[PDB]
């Protein structure tokens, strides 16, 4: 019995510990600790009693089967993956959607979701975009920001809250969460001159405009 103490040595580099395996021995107090070394179920029946067996043999065999495959190690299912992020895309940046039906719109980033998709939400009263997921790949991170460090984003919204169901109707659940978050961002974007006018615009490329030549 004992509370599990967190790992002593911090990760210096991925794969390499900060302390050697000798200093580790002198660190866990290992010097003073030398440890010296179903299926049958009986059920009565109205006679006698019969002994049922769990998981009886299959009743069908295919004419041939595929062999079991070898075992790899590094492969993890998607839910266990590590979710990266561009360092420029901090909470408060203004993004630009590039692929969806809301392309060209200067949408406002709030937070990261557990699936790596960005919870981006331009003010619906400005950009006509709701609380929306968006893959961070298809997004240009502009160098403009707003301090949304005091905004209270709900907790019940998650990668299951924006998951498609299966004629799309706006639930009242959406509308209450919409105006709740817009009631906190809309004061914080009108604190900057022309900022609400900026988001109402749509991004486009004119003649002589080269994306590599310009910078965001």
């Amino acid at each position: 019995k004992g509370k599990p103490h967190c790992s002593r040595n911090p990760v210096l580099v991925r794969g390499i510990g900060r302390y050697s395996r000798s200093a580790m021995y002198s660190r866990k107090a290992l010097y003073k600790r030398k440890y010296a070394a179903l299926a049958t179920v009986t059920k009565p029946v109205g006679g006698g009693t019969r002994v049922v067996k769990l998981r009886k043999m299959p009743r069908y065999y295919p004419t041939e089967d595929v062999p079991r495959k070898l075992l790899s190690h590094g492969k993890k299912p998607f839910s266990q993956h590590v979710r990266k992020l561009r360092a420029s895309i901090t909470p408060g940046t203004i993004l630009i959607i590039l692929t969806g039906r809301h392309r060209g719109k200067r949408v406002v980033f709030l937070k990261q979701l557990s699936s790596g998709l960005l919870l981006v939400t331009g003010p619906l009263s400005l950009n006509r975009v709701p609380l929306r997921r968006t893959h961070q790949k298809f997004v240009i991170a502009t160098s403009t920001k707003i301090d949304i460090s005091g905004v209270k984003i709900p907790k019940h919204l998650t990668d299951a809250y924006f998951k498609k169901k299966k004629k799309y109707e706006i639930t009242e659940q959406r509308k209450v969460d919409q105006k709740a978050v817009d009631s906190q961002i809309l004061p914080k974007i009108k604190a900057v001159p022309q900022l609400q006018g900026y988001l109402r615009s749509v991004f486009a490329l004119t003649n002589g405009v080269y994306p590599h030549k310009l910078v965001f």
């Binding site: 030398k34 440890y35 010296a36 070394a37």
Partner: peptide
């Protein structure tokens, strides 16, 4: 210690080191 045929008696001292 790293010899099979003539290091058996040697590395029995380590086997008690875990004990």
């Amino acid at each position: 210690i790293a010899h099979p045929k003539l290091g058996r008696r040697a590395r029995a001292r380590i086997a008690r080191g875990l004990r």
